[PDB]
């Protein structure tokens, strides 16, 4: 038994009203009898043992979210996710099918910063390519993957956190555009609901650091039409990528 804030982030209302039961039932109905016999749906707690092992609160744990969309979008909409209908196929609400195979779902999915001696994040293969933003999230509640899943973690060095419902912008501090893997700005997001103690944002003198600011003329700069969140098709690096 713990504590957890469970979906507070979403911004889906239908998934935020539910009761935590019931989203835990669509998260978990459809896993394999081999799988239930050894996971648990474990949704962070309020208070958790983050990756330097230092004890903090779940919205002090920086995740990260790689994104093609920019903050003009994702500063106004936060991280709405690909399947927001009522009654969506159990394809759909399913976490284990969704952190196997990242196909259209209602989780945002995120990844946690792996702080050692020097910080280290999971990083798309194709983070380098195209227009690129790596979203800085400080949030509550959601559910671990690898907790969930131990041994049958699908990609375990993601070390994803994912949130059924999205992720509202107000638990969204920074964003960091890169074109071709060479940074322009640092996003701010003046919304951010700061819960105090974070560490400061990582700057540099040649980067600069932008406010956003609703439409703003710089803000919406994309690739011409979840790529950058497949697990399997990235690795950990040190998380200073653009600089």
């Known amino acids: ?13 239908w998934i935020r ?3 935590l039961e019931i989203i ?3 998260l978990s109905r459809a896993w394999p009898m081999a799988l239930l016999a050894t996971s648990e749906l474990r949704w962070r707690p309020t208070v958790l043992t983050d990756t330097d092992n230092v004890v903090r609160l779940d919205r002090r744990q920086r995740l990260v979210r790689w994104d093609r969309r920019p903050p003009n979008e994702i500063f106004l909409d936060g991280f709405v ?4 209908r009522e009654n969506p196929d159990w394809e759909e609400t399913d976490l284990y099918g969704f952190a196997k195979n990242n196909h259209p779902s209602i989780f945002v999915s995120t990844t946690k ?13 194709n983070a380098n390519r195209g227009i690129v933003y790596q979203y ?3 949030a509550p509640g959601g559910v671990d993957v690898n907790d969930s899943f131990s041994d049958a973690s699908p990609w375990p060095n993601q070390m994803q956190v994912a949130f059924p419902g999205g992720i509202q912008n107000i638990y969204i501090r920074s964003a960091r555009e890169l ?15 700061d819960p105090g103690d974070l560490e400061p944002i990582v700057s540099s003198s040649r ?18 039409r979840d790529d950058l969140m497949y697990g399997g098709t990235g690795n950990v690096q040190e998380d200073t990528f653009g600089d």
């Open 1 to 13: 038994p713990y504590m957890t804030n469970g979906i507070q982030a979403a911004v889906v209302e």
């Open 17 to 19: 009203a539910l009761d």
């Open 24 to 26: 835990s039932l669509l």
């Open 81 to 84: 996710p690909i399947v927001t």
């Open 113 to 125: 910063t792996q702080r050692n001696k020097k910080k280290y994040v999971w990083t798309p293969r």
């Open 136 to 138: 800085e999230i400080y």
């Open 179 to 193: 074109h071709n893997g060479r940074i322009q700005r640092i996003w701010i997001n003046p919304n951010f609901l």
């Open 207 to 224: 980067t600069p650091q932008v406010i956003w600011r609703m439409n703003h003329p710089d803000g919406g700069h994309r690739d011409q």
